[PDB]
Every structure is written in C-alpha cells, then in structure tokens.
Structure 1
Amino acid sequence: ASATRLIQGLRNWASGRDLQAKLQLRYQEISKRTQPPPKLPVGPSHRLSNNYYCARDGRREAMPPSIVMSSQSEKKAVSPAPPIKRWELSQDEPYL
C-alpha cells in the first residue's frame, strides 16, 4: 500500500490487473484483536418445563437393523432408489 504511483502503475500494467483494489497484504480493514465479550445463545433444550429427556433422546430411539430376509406373483422389479436425475448445465457459467 506504501508503493509509489510509478511502481503502482508499473505493477498494475505488468500483472494486467488492478492490484491495489485487492491487496493480499492486510491493513486496518481486518477485525480488532480485542473484542467485546459475547453472549452466546442456548439450545432448544434449555427449557425449565416440557423438557423431559425421554422425549428428546436420540440414542435410545436407535433400533436394531430390521431383518428383511433371513435363513432363520408378477411383482415389479425394483431399484434401490429411483434413477438419478440428469444434472442441469449451469445457467451461471456453462463454458459453452
């Protein structure tokens, strides 16, 4: 940022870009190293009522794997899922 306008114009010309607009070195535009203290919010389970853990217990609603076939008609042939949708070419920048 401290460069003279002769070196600045030379540097912009040699790169072919406006380099002073986007300087990779950092100056006073970055955040302060000292910040005010935060007040972080609490989650949804910080409630004094209607907050029994048996109604929000993720690990205890895990089930054993449902056994479909075990060795102890004209029904449709299935796939594991419907076939994947063909992607759309990008409207932003297709390179075509």
Structure 2
Amino acid sequence: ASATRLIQGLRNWASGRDLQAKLQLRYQEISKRTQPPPKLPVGPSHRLSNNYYCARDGRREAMPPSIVMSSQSEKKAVSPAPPIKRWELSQDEPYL
C-alpha cells in the first residue's frame, strides 16, 4: 500500500491488472483482534416442557437392516433408482 505511484503504475502495467483494488497484503480492512463477547444461541431441545428424550431419540430409532431376501408373473424389471437426469450446461459461463 505504500508503493509510489510510479512503481504502482509500472506494476499495474506489467501485471495488466488494477492490483491496488485487490491487494494480497492485509491492512486495516480486517477484523479487530479483540472482539465483543458472544451470546451464542441454544438449540431446539432447550425447552422446559414437551421435551421428553424418547420423542427425539435418534439412536433408538435406528433399526436392524430389513432382510429383503434370505436363504433361511409379468412383473416389471427394476433399477436401483430412476436413470440420472442429464446435466444442463451452465448459463453462467459454459465456455461456449
């Protein structure tokens, strides 16, 4: 940031870019190293009523795997999912 405008002009000419608008060295635009103290929020289970753990127990809703076939007519041939939709070319910048 302390470069003279002659060196700054030579530098912007050699790079071809306005380098002072986007400097890679950091200055007073960055955050303070001392911040105010946060007040972090609580989640949805911080409630005093209607908050039984059995109604939100994720680990105890996991089941053993359903055995579809075990060795102890004109039905449709299936796939593991529908076929994948063809991706669309970018409207942003397709390079086309």
Tell me if TM exceeds 0.5.
yes
CA-to-aligned-CA distance 1:31-76 (integer Å, 9 cap, x gap) = 0000000000000000000000000000000000000000011000
Q: Does 1:2 align with 2:2?
A: yes
Secondary structure of the residue aligned to 2:60 is: helix
Secondary structure of the residue aligned to 1:69 is: strand
Aligned residues: 96
1:7-86 equivalence runs, <5 A: 7-86=7-86
1:6 Cα deviation from its structure 2 partner? 0.1
- Aligned alpha-carbon RMSD (Å): 0.2
- The unaligned stretches of length 5 or more in structure 2 are none
1:90 Cα deviation from its structure 2 partner? 0.2
Distance 1:72 1:47 in 2: 48
Q: Which has the higher contact order (CA 8 A, sep 6+)?
A: 1
Q: TM-score, normalised by structure 2?
A: 1.00
1:7 Cα deviation from its structure 2 partner? 0.1
Distance 2:87 2:53 in 1: 43
Distance 1:43 1:4 in 2: 53
Q: Percent of aligned pairs with the same residue?
A: 100
- The unaligned stretches of length 5 or more in structure 1 are none
Distance 1:16 1:3 in 2: 17
Secondary structure of the residue aligned to 1:91 is: coil
Distance 1:73 1:67 in 2: 22
